[PDB]
Ligand binder design. Structure first.
Ligand SMILES: *[C@@H]1O[C@H](CO)[C@@H](O[C@@H]2O[C@H](CO)[C@@H](O)[C@H](O)[C@H]2NC(C)=O)[C@H](O)[C@H]1NC(C)=O
Length: 264
């Protein structure tokens, strides 16, 4: 289950002058989350979703920081020169996703009157101009100023919302446990069990000397319902003498994997 957070800040400038107002569009995991004034953040669908659980958090912390960046961009715009007559806008879309990889990505993009003219990879800080060119000056304008004023928080936030239950994570890792069935001549029966996981597509299987056992050598348990809406299942094969050293159970679930050996 991948996740992402995106804030869309828009700012206006009428004939050079920069308006006092501005707005932020926030989408959590690709869904309308909040909308923010200069003095308020209103929850959206997911906005409420959350609203219940914690109460109001999609208020304070947020509204505070968003306004700031707003007032900040307000300047960033004021800064640009060739402000032709009319109503114009400058948008800064900060994006950041958390891939299955558990790996991260966080960028930020700038648009003039809707046209993307400059973007940057917040992680590696690489600037980039799209397929057009003369937006360069604009890009330069912005770029420079940004630097001048100089003379994390997204993912921070994403992680937060995530961990705080704002978004209902929908994947539960299984519990693997290898057990042996004391034995005689045909020898023992090691059994690999996976429980309490969700969703249902899981991969259980034994491996002797690294190589996967054939479908037959092992016995399979159906994928059945387990605790709190989870599932559970199992796999076993007949091991001989003291050869467990070579046997290992392998399990895969929604992209995650792990190997378990035979107890002593
Ligand atoms: C980012 O935010 C702005 C404001 O919500 C979006 O810009 C508007 O989008 C619609 C469709 O293009 C236009 O009719 C409006 O005139 C646009 N400008 C403004 C100032 O509202 C923008 O499309 C949003 N989404 C993205 C991906 O940038």
């Amino acid at each position: 289950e991948p996740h992402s957070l995106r804030y869309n800040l828009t700012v206006l400038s009428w004939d050079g002058s920069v308006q006092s107002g501005f707005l932020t569009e926030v989408h959590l995991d690709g869904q309308p989350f909040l909308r923010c004034d200069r003095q308020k953040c209103r929850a959206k669908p997911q906005g409420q979703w959350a609203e219940d659980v914690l109460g109001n958090k999609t208020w304070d912390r947020e509204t505070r920081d968003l306004t700031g960046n707003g007032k900040d961009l307000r300047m960033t715009l004021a800064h640009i020169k060739d402000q032709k007559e009319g109503l114009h806008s400058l948008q800064e879309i900060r994006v950041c996703e958390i891939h299955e990889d558990n790996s991260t990505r966080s960028s930020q993009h700038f648009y003039y009157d809707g046209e993307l003219f400059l973007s940057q990879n917040l992680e590696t800080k690489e600037w980039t101009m799209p397929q057009s060119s003369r937006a360069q000056t604009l890009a330069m304008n912005v770029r420079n100023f940004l630097k001048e004023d100089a003379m994390a928080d997204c993912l921070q936030e994403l992680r937060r919302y995530l961990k705080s239950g704002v978004v209902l994570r929908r994947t539960v890792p299984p519990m693997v446990n290898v057990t042996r069935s004391e034995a005689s001549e045909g020898n023992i029966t090691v059994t690999c069990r996976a429980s309490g996981f969700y969703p249902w597509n899981i991969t259980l299987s034994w491996r002797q000397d690294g190589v996967s056992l054939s479908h037959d050598t092992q016995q399979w348990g159906d994928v059945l319902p387990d605790g709190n809406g989870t599932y559970q299942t199992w796999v076993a094969t007949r091991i001989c003498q003291g050869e467990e050293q070579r046997f290992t159970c392998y399990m895969e679930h929604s992209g995650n994997h792990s190997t378990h050996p035979v107890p002593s």
